[PDB]
Design a protein around this ligand. Sequence first.
Ligand SMILES: O=C(c1ccco1)N1CCN(C(=O)C2CC2)CC1
Length: 185
Amino acid sequence: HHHHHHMVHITLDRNTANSWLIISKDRRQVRMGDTHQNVSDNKERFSNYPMVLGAQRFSSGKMYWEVDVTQKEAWDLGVCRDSVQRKGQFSLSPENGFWTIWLWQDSYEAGTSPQTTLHIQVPPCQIGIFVDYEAGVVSFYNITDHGSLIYTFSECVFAGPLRPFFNVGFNYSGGNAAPLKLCPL
Ligand SMILES: O=C(c1ccco1)N1CCN(C(=O)C2CC2)CC1
């Protein structure tokens, strides 16, 4: 792909984070803590899952960023509507305002309803995410495999400003403590 020139500098929004997440001082890394991180509750925080939003809001244009997922067993990545539900249980779907892929139990899937199996021969250590607001496209790329396409959501109905979306996943196994990291331009 040739989307690299639309690179944007993404930072994480502490105020949206689940209360167990630890965001680095530079706001470029997030990981699961082993306990509540001693923050006050607010209506923006994801309550049920280890999720956080980027600070940036997109309502036009073409945007590209990269995320490091090295050594993780479980995660979700993509983009969501600023007004997604924060509290309680919900599925990741375009009907609920999410355009995402994930790793879970050694398989990769796109967050369609119902979910779609992905075909990845080279497990990615870094994921590229491309958004074309006007075209209604969200695409995912395997940076470890020379940028190969993972998945394209097309005919997207964003219906609002978009925010970068992250889930570091639970760490019930003791094998999923590693962070998500926003990779340098
Ligand atoms: O954004 C998308 C989309 C892009 C790719 C796949 O779906 N959609 C379609 C599914 N949706 C609905 O059907 C709405 C409940 C009516 C929500 C918008």
